[PDB]
Amino acid sequence: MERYENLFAQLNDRREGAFVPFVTLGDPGIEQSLKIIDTLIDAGADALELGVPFSDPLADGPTIQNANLRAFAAGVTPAQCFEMLALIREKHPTIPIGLLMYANLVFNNGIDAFYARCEQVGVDSVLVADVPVEESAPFRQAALRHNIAPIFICPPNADDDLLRQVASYGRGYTYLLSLHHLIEKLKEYHAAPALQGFGISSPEQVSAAVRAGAAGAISGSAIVKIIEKNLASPKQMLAELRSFVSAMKAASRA
Amino acid sequence: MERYENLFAQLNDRREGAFVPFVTLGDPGIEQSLKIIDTLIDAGADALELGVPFSDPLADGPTIQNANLRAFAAGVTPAQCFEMLALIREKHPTIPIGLLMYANLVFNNGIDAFYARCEQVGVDSVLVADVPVEESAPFRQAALRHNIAPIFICPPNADDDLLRQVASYGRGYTYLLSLHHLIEKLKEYHAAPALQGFGISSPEQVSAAVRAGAAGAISGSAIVKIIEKNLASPKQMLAELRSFVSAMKAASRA
Amino acid sequence: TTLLNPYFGEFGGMYVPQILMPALNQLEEAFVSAQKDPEFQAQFADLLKNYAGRPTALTKCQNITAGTRTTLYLKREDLLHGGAHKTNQVLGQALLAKRMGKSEIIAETGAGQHGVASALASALLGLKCRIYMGAKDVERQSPNVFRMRLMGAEVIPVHSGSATLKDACNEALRDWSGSYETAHYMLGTAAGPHPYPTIVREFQRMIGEETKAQILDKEGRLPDAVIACVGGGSNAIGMFADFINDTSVGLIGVEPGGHGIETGEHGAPLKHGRVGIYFGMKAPMMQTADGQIEESYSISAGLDFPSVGPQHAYLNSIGRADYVSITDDEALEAFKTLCRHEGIIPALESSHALAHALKMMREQPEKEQLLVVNLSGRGDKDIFTVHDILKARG
Amino acid sequence: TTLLNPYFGEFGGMYVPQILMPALNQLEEAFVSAQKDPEFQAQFADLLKNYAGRPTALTKCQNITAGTRTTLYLKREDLLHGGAHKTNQVLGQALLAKRMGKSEIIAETGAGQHGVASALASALLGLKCRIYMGAKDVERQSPNVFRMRLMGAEVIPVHSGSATLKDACNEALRDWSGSYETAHYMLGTAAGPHPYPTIVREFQRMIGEETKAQILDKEGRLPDAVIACVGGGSNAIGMFADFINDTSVGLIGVEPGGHGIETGEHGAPLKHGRVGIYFGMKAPMMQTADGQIEESYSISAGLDFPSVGPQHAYLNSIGRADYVSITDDEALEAFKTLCRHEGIIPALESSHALAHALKMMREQPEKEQLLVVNLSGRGDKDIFTVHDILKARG
Ligand SMILES: O=P(O)(O)OC[C@@H](O)[C@@H](O)c1c[nH]c2ccccc12
Ligand SMILES: O=P(O)(O)OC[C@@H](O)[C@@H](O)c1c[nH]c2ccccc12
Ligand SMILES: *Cc1c(COP(=O)(O)O)cnc(C)c1O
Ligand SMILES: *Cc1c(COP(=O)(O)O)cnc(C)c1O
Ligand code: NA
Ligand code: NA
């Protein structure tokens, strides 16, 4: 949690939005993934959202589905993902790191153990994609016990009761699914700062999100497409990732 | 009819049984069939039973079924069969000639017309295999109008009412299906003389039939097998037919 | 003599070799006895209800008739155990066999539905079943052949003649001639020698009886017409029988028109054949000018009987029932229409009946009429046939 | 909050992305409304009776049990329109869709029976149907794919993941997320997120209700046990539900043991899996030590759901129902036995239930017991599978 607080305070002092890339850990392999992540950070990522490959990701679109499949082709396991996370943290002490998880991988060897492992490697937040607020109690409780922010999605079809619950239960940031009024209401209820996600692929969308009152924007498919499109040239891949992240981050600045 | 009467009177004066071969007309072709028939007569056949090839002969066993199929392979039609019959009669004025028919071929162009055609070519009798006594009225009436003997089968499962009907309705000969008492009862009722048929393939069966009080014996499959077995040598075929008929006829003599 | 009339007008009779007459008289006698025997009726009813699934539904098809004044019901013999109406009368005939002390069953089959039906009834009732099938049909009907064998029936290919249904019919008779003391011949349609046309009708007549009760319940009146396909005549006579004396009810039988009557490649002997004598009966048949029996052609293997039951020929002659034909393409169109509009996959046999009802509706869409189509079987079996044709045309 | 309890003990819940919650609440609401609405009940009853063919027979199998003190009845869901019990609840769910003002249907299918069922219901009721099926299953199930298409459904192959049922399940949810305003997701078993396990049970419970009435009529008492196969749990919970409060009635669910539990190649998560969270629910599943979801193996494609309905997991936990497994070879033997002794060709799914009843009988042949096996479907579809295996062994 604390890393997000520090980030948003720092960004607010610079009248600046957060730009937050998503990638799947171990796509297209462990080594290339570690390099990808270092490149995202060097290019100006303010935080990271990181997917752990799961067999049945029913909230992931085709682009992300294929990232998981590439990661699985490389033999990537949750255990290897946690080793990756420890090293990323050891390299980069302040950048917030969030995980995008599916419930079974969290519940598998015990909800408590999962969040304890997150805390040990230096993860800051966890969004469990198939756990709605209604089912979230054990997850959010375990997360808070281990100083991990539980992240909730605030979708379009969101009514006032849901806004209030998301505001009360969430920490770190609110995942605002792709909105001015939603943003005002979340602020009114003292919700965690909003990051807009879903379909963010161009600089103007980042500036738009910040203008609308969001604290930043998350981009996944756009980033993962660059990986998909450049599998044959790892060097070209990094270059294009650098270019894209730098442009997206620049759009967040005052 | 009259030809049978004359035959049986002649054979009775010589204390002799009739031997009566069956073949399918046009098996294995028209020419070879005419030769077969002339050979049967020369070898000592007392009368002939002649099948007209029919598509669905449900009283014929496999041997006869295959004779029909050979005849059909040669394109043999009922019309060609009647041309054959006229010529056989023109060659052999006294030998009784009986047809083995299926009902549809008799009924097809009119029952009356069929028996009129039999009379024209010099046929003496007609056994309609799928017409039991119960259905026989129009057939037996038309046959008698054209001086053709209607032949009835007297099977094993024959009760006294049936014996009486067969005796009353039949002429020429009674087809006695393969019996001393049946034979006595038929004689008691003034039935047409009995010819035993079904499974007659050896000289001793002919002598047995005559000893039992039958006026003779009919043999088909045995004869037709000789045809089936010798298709490749028509000359051998005739020789073996001559040998078989001569032996069978000899067994009928006092 | 006989107990019952073997003729329907000029049509019918007992044209079998003399040796088979005792078997036919025995059967007629046992049938007449069974029909008066309340214990037989109770046993047959019990099997029909608790094993076969009677009564079958009468389904109103409202999507098909939209925008017309036709109301169309389907009598759902497709829902009967085994997927066709054939089950009704094999159960009755199997019970008769047991009443006569017979332990064995002989049956003939073409498309294989009657064979499967005979095999299932024999399995249930502890009879030894052997089935004759033309080699050409054995080749075409591996699924049905395999079903018969799973149910313990012996399947015997017939290579004689055209090696199709008529030839199996011949071989079935050949066998019974010699074994009728312990074996019953379970004929598969309302044809052949007396008493079979009568027995088969009486063991299918619940189709029409139920239809009458059901239509009175749901509509408060009788149908304007009842419509059924005609291969040999069993499903049609089973639908028709209870309505014969209801003079206001039209009875419409549909024969296969194949590629078209004018092509000569059809299976419509009643209206386009010639009266002959074959398979134990005097009836209209497919035959050459010379009197040799020929095959019926249809897209549907089940409408391949090259003649028709004598009671249909009689009902036609007196004008009580009307017979029509439907082509392969019309049947195919009706098949596709029922699947898409009602979610019912009909047998291609039954699709001929449906097609004629569809014609009655479409030809005169403001004619108010209440029609019942006998849906004689389900069409799961015809999926490959319909697939391939639709594939061959694109 | 919800109107009904989403849990059966620890099992069940609503583990879906937040965006899907309104769809689930809407559906629950519509269901609760529909269940109190006599016009809905009348309409559903009418379809079940007059279109689907309810009530289904309860058949006493006397040949199978000869020489033992077991009396065995089969509940004949094989006689239902479509050939399986799946038809019951697709009709209910289609009516719900219409009650909610939806014009479109999304369904998932494995072996294809639920897909065919969804397509037929949609055809009848004027809904636009699209069906998701794993590419591996599409390849294996051309006949069922073609049936769906004849009935006007759009069939969509799924290439993601293992390209089997679980992956179709994922893609079906993906779609509904974005289209739930006009489309209803017609889930095919008593599993997934609340309210589906409850809805599916309630729209299958006529199986058990009829069974109770029928067994009381014929035997004057309740069964000692009712036995049903368990893929996802729908036919089994439909049989069980009305007997849950009848403490004397055993409830036995049969999972596929595949090549043997010890081989790891099976489909028995309830007794041999591990509790997880997937497909919207907390339930026993087939999963790696790491928590990745795996496939169920069975000779029967229809028992391939890699988890099980939460109400079964609950009934097991409290000891109200007992769950067992049956191997491929045991199911095959039961299939062959029913065909030969009763003339009924059972689905290979249902053959698992039958096999366990046969074991109960044979193991203890002087134990007096009255058993009902839910015959969830017919096995015409399994003829090729059974043929090839029997051919491969000789
Ligand atoms: O890919 P997009 O359209 O840029 O959206 C980010 C999204 O993919 C990422 O945040 C994410 C990956 N998997 C998820 C599951 C649920 C919610 C969000 C996600
Ligand atoms: O062939 P066999 O067993 O010798 O029997 C003569 C018989 O074939 C012949 O008379 C015949 C041929 N076709 C028939 C039909 C019915 C009665 C008799 C026949
Ligand atoms: C055999 C069959 C027919 C045709 O025979 P009929 O005796 O004329 O009924 C019709 N429908 C089905 C489904 C059949 O199996
Ligand atoms: C699909 C299917 C099953 C298994 O699913 P359940 O939900 O467990 O009933 C069983 N039998 C048949 C015939 C099926 O089609
Ligand atoms: Na016909
Ligand atoms: Na399962």
What is the residue-wise DSSP string for chain B?
-HHHHHHHHHHHHTT--EEEEEEETTSS-HHHHHHHHHHHHHTT-SSEEEEPP-S--TT--HHHHHHHHHHHHTT--HHHHHHHHHHHHHH-SSS-EEEEE-HHHHHTT-HHHHHHHHHHHT--EEEETT--GGG-HHHHHHHHHTT-EEP-EE-TT--HHHHHHHHHH--S-EEEE--HHHHHHHHHTTPPPEEEESS--SHHHHHHHHHTT-SEEEE-HHHHHHHHHTTT-HHHHHHHHHHHHHHHHHTT--
Taking alpha carbons only, the member of B79, B23, B71 closest to residue B47 is B23
Enumerate the β-bridge partners of residue D377. D84
Residue of C nearest to B159 (CA): C22
Cis peptide before B53 (omega within 30 of 0): no
First to last CA, chain A: 25
Cis peptide before C195 (omega within 30 of 0): yes
CA C296, chain centre distance (Å)? 15
Distance, CA of A235 to CA of D358 (rounded, Å): 66
Do at least 3 CB pairs under 8 Å connect C with D?
yes
Residue of D nearest to C149 (CA): D340
Between the CA of C230 and the centroid of ligand 3 the distance, in Å, is 7
Q: Name subunits touching A (3+ CB pairs < 8 A).
A: D
Residue pair C108/C188 in contact (Cβ under 8 Å)? The answer is: yes
| Phi, psi for residue C170 in degrees, rounded to 5 | -60, -45
* CB hemisphere CA count around C238 (13 angstroms): 28
**Residue B56 and residue C293: Cβ atoms within 8 Å?**
yes
First to last CA, chain C: 59
Chain C CB within 8 Å of residue D122 CB: yes
Alpha carbon nearest to ligand 4 atom 4, residue = D231
B108, B133, B152 member nearest C276 (Cβ)? B108
Q: From the CB of D201, is ligand 4 less than 6 Å away?
A: no
Alpha carbon nearest to ligand 2 atom 6, residue = B220
Candidates D235, D279, D325, D374: which one to mutate for ligand 4, based on the most atoms within 8 Å of Cβ? D235
Distance, CA of A102 to CA of B45 (rounded, Å): 98
Annotated resolution, angstroms:
1.7
With beta carbons under 8 A apart, name residues in chain D contacting C387.
Answer: 146
Enumerate the β-bridge partners of residue C250. C225
B55, B130, B162 member nearest C161 (Cβ)? B55
Q: From the CB of B98, is ligand 2 less than 6 Å away?
A: no
Instruction: Pick the ligand that lies closest to the CA of residue D191.
Output: 4
Q: Which is the closest atom of ligand 2 to the Cα of B199?
A: 3
Quick one: angle between helices A78-91 and A30-42, nearest 10?
30
Q: Between residues 130 and 169 of chain C, which touch chain D (CB distance below 8 Å)?
A: 143, 146-147, 150-152
Chain C interface, mutation test: which of D81, D113, D114, D342, most C Cβ atoms within 10 Å? Answer: D81
**Breaks in chain A at C–N > 2.5 Å: after which residues?**
178
Taking alpha carbons only, the member of D268, D109, D111, D163 closest to residue A56 is D163
Radius of gyration from C-alpha coordinates of chain C: 20
Candidates C75, C229, C299, C351: which one to mutate for ligand 3, based on the most atoms within 8 Å of Cβ? C229
- Find the angle CA(C84)-CA(C86)-CA(C90) to the nearest 5 degrees: 140
First to last CA, chain B: 25
Q: Between residues 299 and 338 of chain D, which touch chain C (CB distance below 8 Å)?
A: 336
Residue pair C51/C354 in contact (Cβ under 8 Å)? The answer is: no
Q: From the CB of C197, is ligand 3 less than 6 Å away?
A: no
For residue C255, the surrounding DSSP H or E stretch is: strand C250-258
Candidates A58, A152, A221, A244: which one to mutate for ligand 1, based on the most atoms within 8 Å of Cβ? A221
A107, A131, A177 member nearest D19 (Cβ)? A177
Q: Specify the long-range contacts of residues A235-240, CB closer than 8 Å, at least 24 apart.
A: A237/A32, A237/A36, A238/A35, A238/A36, A238/A39
Q: Which is the closest atom of ligand 3 to the Cα of C231?
A: 8
In D234-303, which ranges are E strands? 250-258, 274-278, 280-285
DSSP B27-42: SS-HHHHHHHHHHHHH
For residue A127, the surrounding DSSP H or E stretch is: strand A125-128
B54, B59, B61 member nearest C292 (Cβ)? B54
Residues 6+ apart with CB under 8 A from C97: C105, C127, C184, C186
Distance, CA of B182 to CA of B179 (rounded, Å): 5
D14, D177, D287 member nearest A135 (Cβ)? D14
Edge-to-edge, what's the strand order for the sheet holding C128-134? Answer: C154-158, C128-134, C104-109, C183-185
Chain D interface, mutation test: which of A135, A136, A139, A153, most D Cβ atoms within 10 Å? Answer: A135
**Residue D151 and residue C339: Cβ atoms within 8 Å?**
yes
The nearest CA of chain C is from the CA of D110 a distance in Å of: 19
Alpha-helix residue ranges (DSSP H) falling in chain A: 2-13, 30-42, 62-73, 78-91, 103-107, 111-121, 137-145, 160-169, 180-188, 203-211, 221-229, 234-250
Taking alpha carbons only, the member of C57, B111, A246, B29 closest to residue D47 is C57
Taking alpha carbons only, the member of B38, B132, B117 closest to residue B81 is B117
CA B137, chain centre distance (Å)? 21
Q: From the CB of D231, is ligand 4 less than 6 Å away?
A: yes
Enumerate the β-bridge partners of residue C59. C74
DSSP state of D293: B
Between the CA of B133 and the centroid of ligand 5 the distance, in Å, is 28
Q: From the CB of D91, is ligand 4 less than 6 Å away?
A: no
The DSSP bridge pattern shows strands D250-258 and D225-229 to be: parallel
Dig out the tokens for C174 from the structure.
């050949």
All domains in chain B, ordered by first residue: 1-254 (3.20.20.70)
Alpha carbon nearest to ligand 4 atom 7, residue = D234
Torsion, Cα B28 B33 B35 B39, to 10 degrees, reads 100
Distance, CA of A23 to CA of A223 (rounded, Å): 7
Distance, CA of C197 to CA of C205 (rounded, Å): 12
Tell me if residue C346 falls in helix, strand or coil: strand
Domain ranges of chain C: 8-52+86-204, 53-85+205-390
Q: From the CB of B100, is ligand 2 less than 6 Å away?
A: yes
Q: Specify the long-range contacts of residues C263-266, CB closer than 8 Å, at least 24 apart.
A: C265/C297, C266/C296, C266/C297, C266/C298, C266/C325
- Find the angle CA(D43)-CA(D47)-CA(D51) to the nearest 5 degrees: 160
Distance, CA of C186 to CA of C196 (rounded, Å): 9
Between the CA of D231 and the centroid of ligand 4 the distance, in Å, is 6
Chain A CB within 8 Å of residue D291 CB: yes
Residues 6+ apart with CB under 8 A from B110: none
Q: From the CB of B27, is ligand 2 less than 6 Å away?
A: no
CATH fold for domain C53-85+205-390: Rossmann fold (3.40.50)
Distance, CA of D105 to CA of D119 (rounded, Å): 9
Distance, CA of D355 to CA of D329 (rounded, Å): 10
The DSSP bridge pattern shows strands D7-8 and D11-15 to be: antiparallel
CA C27, chain centre distance (Å)? 20
C52, C123, C386 member nearest D341 (Cβ)? C123
Taking alpha carbons only, the member of C68, C17, C66 closest to residue C280 is C17
Q: What separation in angstroms does the CA of D342 have from each of A149, C217, D37, D337, D349?
A: 63, 34, 41, 8, 18
Q: Which numeric CATH code is attached to D8-52+86-204?
A: 3.40.50.1100
DSSP-based helix, strand, coil % in chain C, nearest 5 = 50, 20, 30
Cis peptide before D223 (omega within 30 of 0): no
Alpha carbon nearest to ligand 1 atom 19, residue = A60
Q: From the CB of A198, is ligand 1 less than 6 Å away?
A: yes
Annotated catalytic residues of A are 49, 60
Distance, CA of C45 to CA of D350 (rounded, Å): 27
Alpha carbon nearest to ligand 2 atom 17, residue = B129
Q: Which is the closest atom of ligand 4 to the Cα of D350?
A: 11
Q: Which is the closest atom of ligand 4 to the Cα of D230?
A: 8
Radius of gyration from C-alpha coordinates of chain B: 17
The DSSP bridge pattern shows strands B174-177 and D274-278 to be: unpaired
Between the CA of C376 and the centroid of ligand 3 the distance, in Å, is 7
Dig out the tokens for B44 from the structure.
């000592």
Do D53-85+205-390 and D8-52+86-204 fall under one CATH topology? yes
Chain B CB within 8 Å of residue C5 CB: no
**Method for structure elucidation:** X-ray
Distance, CA of C65 to CA of C69 (rounded, Å): 7
